[PDB]
Write an enzyme that holds these catalytic residues in place. Structure first.
Site, PDB file in Angstrom:
ATOM      1  N   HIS A   1      33.043  14.006   6.383  1.00 39.96           N
ATOM      2  CA  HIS A   1      31.658  13.759   5.909  1.00 39.96           C
ATOM      3  C   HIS A   1      30.288  13.292   6.993  1.00 39.96           C
ATOM      4  CE1 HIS A   1      31.366  10.430   4.388  1.00 39.96           C
ATOM      5  NE2 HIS A   1      32.692  10.391   3.597  1.00 39.96           N
TER       6      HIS A   1
ATOM      7  N   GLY B   1      29.045   2.014   3.246  1.00 45.05           N
ATOM      8  CA  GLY B   1      29.130   1.906   4.496  1.00 45.05           C
ATOM      9  C   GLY B   1      31.026   2.206   4.762  1.00 45.05           C
TER      10      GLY B   1
ATOM     11  N   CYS C   1      33.391   3.856   3.733  1.00 44.35           N
ATOM     12  CA  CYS C   1      34.223   4.901   3.695  1.00 44.35           C
ATOM     13  C   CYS C   1      34.972   5.580   5.239  1.00 44.35           C
ATOM     14  CB  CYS C   1      32.980   6.441   4.115  1.00 44.35           C
ATOM     15  SG  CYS C   1      32.082   6.406   2.355  1.00 44.35           S
TER      16      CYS C   1
HETATM   17  C1  LIG Z   1      28.607   7.419  -5.694  1.00 44.10           C
HETATM   18  N1  LIG Z   1      28.170   7.681  -4.953  1.00 44.10           N
HETATM   19  C2  LIG Z   1      26.676   8.650  -5.099  1.00 44.10           C
HETATM   20  O1  LIG Z   1      26.393   8.721  -6.061  1.00 44.10           O
HETATM   21  C3  LIG Z   1      26.549   9.925  -4.251  1.00 44.10           C
HETATM   22  N2  LIG Z   1      27.872  10.380  -2.896  1.00 44.10           N
HETATM   23  C4  LIG Z   1      27.922   9.553  -1.604  1.00 44.10           C
HETATM   24  C5  LIG Z   1      29.336   9.090  -1.390  1.00 44.10           C
HETATM   25  C6  LIG Z   1      29.998   7.907  -1.719  1.00 44.10           C
HETATM   26  O2  LIG Z   1      30.837   8.456  -2.833  1.00 44.10           O
HETATM   27  N3  LIG Z   1      30.289   7.183  -1.106  1.00 44.10           N
HETATM   28  C7  LIG Z   1      30.647   5.375  -1.758  1.00 44.10           C
HETATM   29  C8  LIG Z   1      31.870   5.233  -1.555  1.00 44.10           C
HETATM   30  N4  LIG Z   1      32.549   4.694  -1.499  1.00 44.10           N
HETATM   31  C9  LIG Z   1      31.871   3.620  -2.700  1.00 44.10           C
HETATM   32  C10 LIG Z   1      30.636   3.170  -2.594  1.00 44.10           C
HETATM   33  C11 LIG Z   1      30.088   2.119  -3.764  1.00 44.10           C
HETATM   34  C12 LIG Z   1      28.080   3.018  -3.458  1.00 44.10           C
HETATM   35  C13 LIG Z   1      27.932   3.539  -3.606  1.00 44.10           C
HETATM   36  C14 LIG Z   1      28.385   4.499  -2.631  1.00 44.10           C
HETATM   37  C15 LIG Z   1      27.728   5.889  -2.280  1.00 44.10           C
HETATM   38  C16 LIG Z   1      29.620   4.963  -2.570  1.00 44.10           C
HETATM   39  C17 LIG Z   1      29.672  10.816  -1.557  1.00 44.10           C
HETATM   40  C18 LIG Z   1      31.475  11.064  -0.222  1.00 44.10           C
HETATM   41  C19 LIG Z   1      31.757  12.355  -0.633  1.00 44.10           C
HETATM   42 CL1  LIG Z   1      33.540  12.459   0.442  1.00 44.10          CL
HETATM   43  C20 LIG Z   1      31.528  13.532  -1.683  1.00 44.10           C
HETATM   44  C21 LIG Z   1      30.474  12.918  -2.624  1.00 44.10           C
HETATM   45  C22 LIG Z   1      29.581  11.502  -2.671  1.00 44.10           C
HETATM   46  C23 LIG Z   1      28.733  10.874  -3.470  1.00 44.10           C
HETATM   47  O3  LIG Z   1      28.755  11.848  -4.000  1.00 44.10           O
END
Ligand SMILES: CNC(=O)CN1C[C@@H](C(=O)Nc2cncc3cccc(C)c23)c2cc(Cl)ccc2C1=O
Ligand SMILES: CNC(=O)CN1C[C@@H](C(=O)Nc2cncc3cccc(C)c23)c2cc(Cl)ccc2C1=O
Ligand SMILES: [Cl-]
Lengths: 297, 305
Positions: free
Chosen positions: A41, A135, A137
């Site tokens: 991603h 951050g 990931c």
């Molecule tokens: C809570 N996330 C979101 O609202 C948006 N979101 C972004 C992204 C994702 O989960 N990142 C994050 C990863 N780990 C912790 C996180 C804590 C807080 C915030 C974020 C963004 C975090 C993601 C990656 C994939 Cl492979 C698929 C879907 C998503 C996605 O939906």
């Protein structure tokens, strides 16, 4: 004496963490030999998005050094960036896929810089109750067996309940998740029964016996009780695996199951076990044996 | 999201762990630059441990009596000196893996990571706090002496603890890296016991602010309290007194969540009176006191849920 949630020493993994940037997205990568592994991603029709990219679009930073990307390929949900320099700090390693109930250490990273290490378990619903911010990931999960690091998890996303989802190092997700922003939810979770039993054996080893009783149970009667409290079924394999701890403490596995049944039906009555008022399920039988023996890496 | 007991990455400390042997005793040492630091009780036998005269035992030793092993390499001891309860062994090779470091003495309530080692080999890492009674609730077996506690401040390692002994209750006692013990303990096998322990109030408050940041508010109430009334109630549950310094330290978390420190204090008073009623806070059924206000700010998001 003492019983802590203990992680493996992270040094062998710290020397592999890099920062991967593609456009506006920045995340972590794992640099092993001449390849950097990271969530795909960082770039949805992933093949269509990837074909448009060239090697120079991926910026890889190892400390204060810019690595040169000389190739790229996708394997499931993991992007593999071929670099022109083999990591001189590459440890002896394997990529392993773990099962629910198994535990591992997570080295949480931001911008290719390790910030913390914690221990966790792959829940029966395939999520992990981690601690991750934006951050994180590309942060990885691992175990160490002698001097060999076994990489088992790469972080991809956070679900709406605050729990986390990811893949093995071959890009296959744990659980029915996809790497897209879409309506996804963690399924109903259960308690890892064999791990609670291992933790009760650790409490006995450390001098906590108040929950022990004279009773025993059959495996079938225990499983009928365990199903009522959202506990995973206990198999004969679990009973066999708990054999060494049963021999050390003198408490048969089904004798400890009768203690567990009474704890589920009646509670702790204001008492604690190893400093906890809940039944802990994130220590495997092997973790208990290792921590109560002092195995080094 | 999420809140875990998180330790610092241990790599910078792993590259400093060595094995120190003197006679029949083997324990861990910390190799920084050309010096190996270790508990001075490595020069003792089990008999000596009741009333050891370390100065008398050390004068009888020469450099070649101390065997220091770094991985599969034998280091050569070229000097030795005692500083309080730590022995400093001068070696002929500076550690090429020496990180940027400082020696810091911490106060009760402060947290740190412990790299538990046996025979100079790291086995695990966990996070813990210096209890108000100056002990640590660690996880240590025989051979763990010399294992160290630390924090990593950006890229600098601050060494704050060196493991020396296990008390009869299973809790642990040790020194700072200058050999001064935390607490009224001595490196003697004489009758010693941990004093009555208390709960680190400022840390429980920080952890309640972490729960609010992560989206949980079930425990708040419409009340406030004076600092004195809070302390009168807190002492009855074996909680440490909350000082004006603690209230000041909680200022940033109060500003982020919009909940005044004395309002959060009123919520703690109510939790102590009612218990949790089958509910949990950040996955725990007990009030957690091993996260400082600094740990909460470092781990949690800067945006409240
Ligand atoms: C809570 N996330 C979101 O609202 C948006 N979101 C972004 C992204 C994702 O989960 N990142 C994050 C990863 N780990 C912790 C996180 C804590 C807080 C915030 C974020 C963004 C975090 C993601 C990656 C994939 Cl492979 C698929 C879907 C998503 C996605 O939906
Ligand atoms: C539990 N202790 C003992 O029975 C003997 N004992 C040895 C030694 C000591 O505490 N070692 C140990 C340290 N940490 C964890 C330990 C777990 C299990 C066993 C041992 C030996 C452990 C020690 C050093 C000092 Cl500086 C002062 C007193 C002593 C002392 O009393
Ligand atoms: Cl401090």
């Amino acid at each position: 004496s003492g019983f802590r949630k203990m992680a493996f020493p992270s040094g062998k993994v710290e020397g592999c963490m890099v920062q991967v940037t593609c456009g506006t997205t920045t995340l972590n990568g794992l640099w092993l030999d001449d390849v950097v592994y990271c969530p795909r991603h960082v770039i949805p029709n992933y093949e269509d998005l990837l074909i448009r990219k060239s090697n120079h679009n991926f910026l890889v930073q190892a400390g204060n050094v810019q690595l040169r990307v000389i190739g790229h390929s996708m394997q499931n949900c993991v992007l593999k960036l071929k670099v022109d320099t083999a990591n001189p700090k590459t440890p002896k390693y394997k990529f392993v896929r773990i099962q629910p109930g198994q535990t591992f250490s997570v080295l949480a990273c931001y911008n290719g810089s390790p910030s913390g290490v914690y221990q966790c378990a792959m829940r029966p619903n395939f999520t992990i109750k981690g601690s991750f911010l934006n951050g994180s990931c590309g942060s990885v999960g691992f175990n160490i067996d002698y001097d060999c690091v076994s990489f088992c998890y790469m972080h991809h996303m956070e679900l709406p309940t605050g729990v986390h989802a990811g893949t093995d190092l071959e890009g296959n997700f744990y659980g029915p998740f996809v790497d897209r922003q879409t309506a996804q939810a963690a399924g109903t979770d259960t308690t890892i029964t064999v791990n609670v039993l291992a933790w009760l054996y650790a409490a006995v080893i450390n001098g906590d016996r108040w929950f022990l009783n004279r009773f025993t149970t059959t495996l079938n009667d225990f499983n009928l009780v365990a199903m009522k409290y959202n506990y995973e079924p206990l198999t004969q394999d679990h009973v066999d695996i708990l054999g060494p701890l049963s021999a050390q403490t003198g408490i048969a596995v089904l004798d400890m199951c009768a203690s567990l049944k009474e704890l589920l039906q009646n509670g702790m009555n204001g008492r604690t076990i190893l400093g906890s008022a809940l039944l802990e399920d994130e220590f495997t039988p092997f973790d208990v044996v290792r921590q109560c023996s002092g195995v080094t890496f």
